[PDB]
Paper text:
The 3 human RAS genes, [name], NRAS, and HRAS, encode 4 different RAS proteins ([name]-4A, [name]-4B, NRAS, and HRAS) which belong to the protein family of small GTPases that function as binary molecular switches involved in cell signaling. In the “off” state, RAS proteins are bound to the nucleotide guanosine diphosphate (GDP), while in the “on” state they are bound to the nucleotide guanosine triphosphate (GTP). The γ-phosphate of GTP holds 2 regions, switch I and switch II, in a compact conformation that allows interaction with downstream effectors, such as CRAF, PI3Kα, and RALGDS, as well as with the allosteric site of SOS1 and SOS2. Oncogenic mutations in RAS impair GTP hydrolysis, leading to stabilization of the activated GTP-RAS form and enhanced RAS signaling.
To overcome the solubility limitations of 22, the chiral N-methyl imidazole derivative 1 was prepared. This compound exhibited a significantly reduced ClogP of 2.6 and had a solubility of 18 µg/mL at pH 6.8 while maintaining nanomolar binding affinity to GTP-KRASG12D (KD = 750 nM) as measured by ITC and with an IC50 of 450 nM in the Alpha Screen. All interactions observed for 22 were maintained, with an additional H bond formed between the imidazole nitrogen and the side-chain oxygen of S39 at a distance of 2.7 Å. Compound 1 maintained the polar interactions to D54 and E37 also addressed by 18 and, in addition, formed a H bond to S39 and displaced 3 water molecules, which are presumably responsible for the >100-fold improvement in potency. It should be noted that T74, which improves potency by 5- to 10-fold, is not yet addressed by 1 and that 1 still contains 7 rotatable bonds. E37 on switch II, to which the phenolic oxygen of 1 H-bonds, is also an important residue for RAS binding to downstream effectors, GEFs, and GAPs, explaining mechanistically how 1 inhibits the binding of multiple key RAS interactions partners. The most potent [name] inhibitor, BI-2852 (1), binds with nanomolar affinity to the active and inactive form of [name]. The SI/II-pocket is involved in interactions with GEFs, GAPs, and downstream effectors, and we provide evidence that compound 1 inhibits all of these PPIs. As observed for compound 18, 1 also binds with similar affinity to [name], NRAS, and HRAS, with the exception of a small selectivity window (5- to 10-fold) to active KRASwt and inactive NRASwt.
Numbering used by the authors: 0 to 168
The structure:
Amino acid sequence: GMTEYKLVVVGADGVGKSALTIQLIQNHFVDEYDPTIEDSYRKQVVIDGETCLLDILDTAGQEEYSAMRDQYMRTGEGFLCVFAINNTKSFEDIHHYREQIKRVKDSEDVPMVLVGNKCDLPSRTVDTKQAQDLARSYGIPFIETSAKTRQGVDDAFYTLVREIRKHKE
Ligand SMILES: Cn1cnc(Cn2ccc3ccc(CNCc4[nH]c5ccccc5c4[C@H]4NC(=O)c5ccc(O)cc54)cc32)c1
Ligand SMILES: Nc1nc2c(ncn2[C@@H]2O[C@H](COP(=O)(O)OP(=O)(O)CP(=O)(O)O)[C@@H](O)[C@H]2O)c(=O)[nH]1
Ligand SMILES: [Mg+2]
């Protein structure tokens, strides 16, 4: 059949939340840095024989708009928790985003995918093993992505849809 999925892209200011979403939807990489307040995007895609209507919320990394988090977290069904592989602080920030999502939703089980973005970059500070260990401690999938090359992009979003589907049963 046809099912809507409300996905939320969260993470530190500059990890590539907007570039990841724009790459998935519009098939192009945004080199520019345009800070986001809040935008939503749409993509109709077939995943495991189901027509999925992805309703994606691209959120603010700027702490200035942190009061918006409570309402979008209550509304969102699944979360892409994005850090950049060249930014250890953004990797540490995942904990705080995950803690707020679980609390606000009263669900330790919340559909979530850990995303290590900017994998096209050689000067990396967060290794694959560090992120795999963190994802294992959360019991969630870990996917390496590049909004530039499209590496892992479809897999990150489709995996999140599959996590929501599983949670609904
Ligand atoms: C706030 N906002 C986001 N997109 C628009 C553009 N827009 C205008 C009318 C129009 C009708 C329909 C949709 C599709 N859903 C947009 C969307 N996708 C989400 C994915 C996950 C969590 C929350 C959403 C939402 C927002 N819906 C909510 O209830 C809400 C609460 C708090 C929010 O900060 C944002 C939203 C866009 C619309 C406005
Ligand atoms: N090399 C490379 N650069 C990336 C990637 N994703 C994003 N960028 C770059 O990082 C910068 C920030 O990306 P952007 O998508 O705006 O990040 P953001 O997390 O949405 C910023 P905000 O939280 O203020 O909305 C941009 O210059 C963009 O080109 C990637 O996968 N690889
Ligand atoms: Mg943005």
